[PDB]
Design a protein around this ligand. Structure first.
Ligand SMILES: *Cc1ccc(C(=O)N2CCOCC2)cc1
Ligand SMILES: *Cc1ccc(C(=O)N2CCOCC2)cc1
Ligand SMILES: [Cl-]
Ligand SMILES: [Cl-]
Ligand SMILES: [Cl-]
Ligand SMILES: [Cl-]
Ligand SMILES: [Mg+2]
Ligand SMILES: [Mg+2]
Lengths: 9, 228, 228, 9
């Protein structure tokens, strides 16, 4: 189950 | 970071992201927050990206060590080292929650900023809940739920169904339901209703907004595929 | 790490490697070295793997920032942040070199341990040379060269041409020649002679030793392909 | 030009 990756910005 | 200019902290946070130095990124953004000014949309993303990467590495390490520890219970070193990583993770979560509480959330009046910070609050309580086992796991879970719920209520009143922050909030709240709250039916229902209402709003969007929204809708779909 | 048992430090270094927590790994292995006992073959690998990963991430970040800095020279933030990363990298290299000097190398009598530590010494001076620009780049380069050369002299007298430590030493010394010493012909000659003499010794090896040696010979071949 | 990877052991 994946949450928002949110690793790149 | 009290002696560094706010603008220099922001600039160095961007450099640290390019260098994949996420611990530095987080320290720079912590310093920028502590300057006391509100954060712009871009600056909020920098704060979030920094700490998500830091705690993401800690969570991955904690899961490796927790798994080894569980296999051994079928010396004290594995438990001790899992405890060390767990304490470090809790400290980072507490730091982020402290920034939100002093004083990002109370000064956030626009829907875009307030929903963003409350989603953040739900996420970092969720990370605390993942490792919680004592007399306060229930209170930590309710703290996550309450933050997510307030963010949901605002996003449904103030944002279109395709807004990427609204969609990512619903995605993570559904993961909270499935993984933390033992409510898989609520998780599936939320992801389905979120996806369907976004699909019906896509016709209003530009080509670039369409790409932003459909990317997050695919993440909702991926979870539904895993859960059903 | 003075209060932790040597065996516990070693055990936790292995756990940290599994968790990809290389900074912790290095701190645990630093503590193990400072117990004052010699290191076993496996323990030497743990020490090397830990610090190679730590400095490897620092070198990658330094190169990102150095490149941005060079594009800007065609505020002080990019230089300042590159300087911060560079200082942190130098500190880690100095720490490793300090461990080798106090007192790993002087107590290393067997060829396998002595060549291993001297290769390490050459490597960490090479990393210092990569960022050196002042009145001591030449001295740093000669320190790297001297360590590699002593290791080469021992390995040629005491180890078979297929020994993985001997092969990896020759590989890294050839990279030193090519990248640091501005001697690409010496680099190519060393890699070629190393490869050819290993190929002629492969018939003596077991299936598992053959796999170990041919893997490193392919790395020599990859460099020769890039250099010729 | 690749040195020994030496990242896994
Ligand atoms: C909570 C959150 C964070 C980021 C985004 C977003 O817009 N992304 C761009 C595309 O990939 C996912 C991240 C939405 C929600
Ligand atoms: C300096 C050095 C380090 C490690 C090795 C080695 O045996 N390896 C196994 C296979 O992949 C490369 C590392 C040789 C030399
Ligand atoms: Cl520990
Ligand atoms: Cl405000
Ligand atoms: Cl800096
Ligand atoms: Cl000895
Ligand atoms: Mg100012
Ligand atoms: Mg003891």
């Amino acid at each position: 189950a994946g949450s928002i990756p949110g690793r790149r910005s | 970071m009290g002696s560094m200019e706010r603008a220099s902290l922001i600039q160095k946070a961007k450099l640290a992201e390019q260098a994949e130095r996420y611990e530095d990124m987080a320290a720079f953004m912590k310093g920028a927050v502590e300057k006391g000014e509100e954060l712009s949309c871009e600056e909020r993303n920098l704060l979030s990206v920094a700490y998500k990467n830091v705690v993401g590495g800690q969570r991955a390490a904690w899961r490796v060590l927790s798994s080894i520890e569980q296999k051994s219970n079928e010396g004290p070193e594995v438990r001790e080292y899992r405890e060390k990583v767990e304490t470090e993770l809790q400290g980072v979560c507490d730091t982020v929650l402290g920034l939100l509480d002093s004083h990002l959330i109370k000064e956030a009046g626009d829907a875009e900023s307030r929903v963003f910070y409350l989603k953040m609050k739900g996420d970092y309580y969720r990370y605390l809940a993942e490792v919680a086992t004592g007399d306060d796991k229930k209170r930590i879970i309710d703290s996550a739920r309450s933050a997510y719920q307030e963010a949901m209520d605002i996003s449904k009143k103030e944002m279109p169904p395709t807004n990427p922050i609204r969609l990512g909030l619903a995605l993570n709240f559904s993961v909270f339901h499935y993984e933390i709250a033992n409510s898989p039916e609520e998780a599936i229902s939320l992801a389905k209703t979120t996806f369907d209402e976004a699909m019906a709003d896509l016709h209003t969007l530009s080509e670039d907004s369409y790409k932003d929204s459909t990317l997050i809708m695919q993440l909702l779909r991926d979870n539904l595929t895993l859960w059903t």
